[PDB]
Symmetry: D2
Subunit: 123 residues, 4 copies
């Protein structure tokens, strides 16, 4: 975990994020897009649970990205919840929730759900 | 948003979190539990999209909490994705994903999904 | 369960569905809309698990509605997964997934997630 | 869609389901397990939206399985929401919700979320 989390990760769609896993569970870094209403890099912040594991279990973690930077403001934010598995072919398996700001009437259709798998190699 | 987000929020189950919404989209604070395998306060970090809105839309945001502190380590993390609506009865409506670290075989059952509504009054 | 499930149910948004819970776990009925890209009644089908419970637990169930009828074809389908709780104030608490048919490129944004609570009284 | 949906499908985990897509949007069939608290075949029922598509879009559909049969009763039900894509390498991409019946206190942790991809070839 931590040392093994730190670095660059890529997902199937081509997205890329670099993250630093700090000693006390913090995750900080940037997410650069590859396919949605995003354009360039965005700040990401999250946490991981720093004392994961005598039974080769994954390390739970999560992070958020608000889709606002100096070139674009999509009025939306995505959170990824998942776990890190290390080794030869280390990966971060996640499910994500993307919420867009809506008026009260359209709130029922504000959140999309999906999944993403990240690898250290692309892809 | 931001100023209106800053403060103490409570949900139906009794959970409480205090958050500070910084000028450039950051969210920092603590989450204290009221009903799960959590015990005390945990650090939370997230982001909100700081330039939300000529059509009274909500402000999208998200945050993460790794369930590890000095009294407990649940080997899990939760992410909340949702939006903030201000006014008389301001609230944060969210959907959440809670992932626990599992072995590769139990990964299919690692993530729970639910929703939470937070108010400035309890409840 | 079963006998207690059979009947008319209403949710917060105003939707209404009538369902018949058959002896061997079947659920059949119609869903009439109150607020989305639906107009009139749609067929619903699902199942419930018919032998639920010495510890007052809910009865798990789920059903699907394809948003196609003789007046509208939204090219989408919704599934509701949840449980039935009986008694004085019986209810069906669910989380739902609504998928729209997309081209392969927009598949990442094809599914919305939400929740609905149904009561025998409106609301 | 329909004719193309009818048949046997397999997912990564080894699960198998045979389904018949009827003329008016019905889906009927069985699901046989390969990896969870299921043992043998279970009845499945669902719907698909029968008039999908001049822009090669997927066909939205969904189905439910209550995990009760003559050998096992898991007191749970799963719903799969997704779309069918045909062609050379036809597939059904879905996200699923699995709800277990709980007491009112544990209801917050009753639903798991995941995804499954089915192919006509195994896998
Ligand atoms: N890597 C991924 N990219 C898309 C999904 C979840 S977040 C999303 C991109 C969203 C871009 C901003 C937007 O369109 O609002 N996974
Ligand atoms: N306010 C909420 N509390 C429960 C749900 C989502 S997070 C959860 C508490 C989890 C505590 C840690 C654990 O049990 O692993 N909403
Ligand atoms: N009772 C509810 N109505 C909306 C949510 C989930 S299903 C949805 C209505 C969808 C109508 C068809 C469509 O817009 O595609 N809950
Ligand atoms: N093909 C899949 N199998 C598991 C996931 C979702 S449904 C699940 C099997 C559940 C079996 C019954 C149970 O354990 O309660 N996908």
């Amino acid at each position: 975990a931590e040392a093994g989390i730190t670095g660059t990760w890529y997902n199937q769609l081509g997205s890329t994020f670099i993250v630093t896993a700090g000693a006390d569970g913090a995750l900080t870094g940037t997410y650069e897009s590859a396919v949605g209403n995003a354009e360039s890099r965005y700040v990401l912040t999250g946490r991981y649970d720093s004392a994961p594991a005598t039974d080769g279990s994954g390390t739970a973690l999560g992070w958020t990205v608000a889709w606002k930077n100096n070139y674009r403001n999509a009025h939306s934010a995505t959170t990824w919840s998942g776990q890190y598995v290390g080794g030869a072919e280390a990966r971060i398996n996640t499910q994500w929730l993307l919420t867009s700001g809506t008026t009260e009437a359209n709130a029922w259709k504000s959140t999309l759900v999906g999944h993403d798998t990240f690898t250290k190699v692309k892809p």
